[PDB]
Amino acid sequence: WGYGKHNGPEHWHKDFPIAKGERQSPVDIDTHTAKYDPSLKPLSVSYDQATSLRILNNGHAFNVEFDDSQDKAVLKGGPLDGTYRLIQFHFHWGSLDGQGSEHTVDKKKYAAELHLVHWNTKYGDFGKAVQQPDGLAVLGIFLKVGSAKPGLQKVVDVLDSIKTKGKSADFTNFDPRGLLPESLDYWTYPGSLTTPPLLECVTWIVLKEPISVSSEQVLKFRKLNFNGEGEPEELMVDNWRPAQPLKNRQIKASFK
Numbered sequence: 001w002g003y004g005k006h007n008g009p010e011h012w013h014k015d016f017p018i019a020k021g022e023r024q025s026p027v028d029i030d031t032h033t034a035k036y037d038p039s040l041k042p043l044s045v046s047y048d049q050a051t052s053l054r055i056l057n058n059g060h061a062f063n064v065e066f067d068d069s070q071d072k073a074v075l076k077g078g079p080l081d082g083t084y085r086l087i088q089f090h091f092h093w094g095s096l097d098g099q100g101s102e103h104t105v106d107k108k109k110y111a112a113e114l115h116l117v118h119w120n121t122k123y124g125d126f127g128k129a130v131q132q133p134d135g136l137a138v139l140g141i142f143l144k145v146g147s148a149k150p151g152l153q154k155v156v157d158v159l160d161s162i163k164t165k166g167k168s169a170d171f172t173n174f175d176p177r178g179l180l181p182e183s184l185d186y187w188t189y190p191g192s193l194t195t196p197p198l199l200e201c202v203t204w205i206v207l208k209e210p211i212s213v214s215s216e217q218v219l220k221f222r223k224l225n226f227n228g229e230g231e232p233e234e235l236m237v238d239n240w241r242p243a244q245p246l247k248n249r250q251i252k253a254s255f256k
Ligand SMILES: [O][B]1([O])O[C]C2=C1[C]=C(N1[C]=C([C]OC3=[C][C]=C(F)[C]=[C]3)N=N1)[C]=[C]2
Pocket: 115, 117, 127, 130, 138, 193, 194, 195, 196, 197, 199
């Protein structure tokens, strides 16, 4: 599977029939139809003890991986019951500034979308958590092109060292707090992985406030390669799944 005409989102259902399931992601967030839920709690994002390890080009995106063998970087509160440990973050982005996000807001596409991936500690490991309807909590953050994001530049600067599929680099001592906007106001809904195997295991928490990144920062994302070293060059761009039908779901807002 991939993001080409021949292996992209329109083809995934043949290997992963859940692609046409009842709680697929991403979705369009209709801001006028989302329901303010005054009983939703503030998010608790606790990243002060986060231990970043490595950055990997996996042929679909790049992952910044964390030590998830202890409660070092956790997400709690909001719609969540219990404790979710940060395992990795990655992005989805476009070939052009007017596309790249997976979620949309009133049909608006952002230049990119950050996914901070967390798993429910009551399931013991990530592999068990993805088999559960409440196994993952993904914090989604939109990127718009404007001012540079200083907290992103360490990521941008290392991408030269992981250009091709299967390359990795040390990525210790990275603080993911530098990727957050000021506000933790959010939308939430039950959904899925946006990539095969498209498992319906995710509580989505999408922040209302986008972060700003510079044109030069997102340009560097677009110089990555989907291919391995010594293969024909395929730029890693447009690694996003389009919005899927909402079906029998309500999107809830933490704010009025
Ligand atoms: O880009 B996204 O769609 O957005 C959100 C998101 C994405 C991919 C993952 N993700 C996939 C894998 C692969 O590991 C697996 C192991 C066992 C499985 F059964 C499935 C996957 N690891 N993290 C997690 C969260």
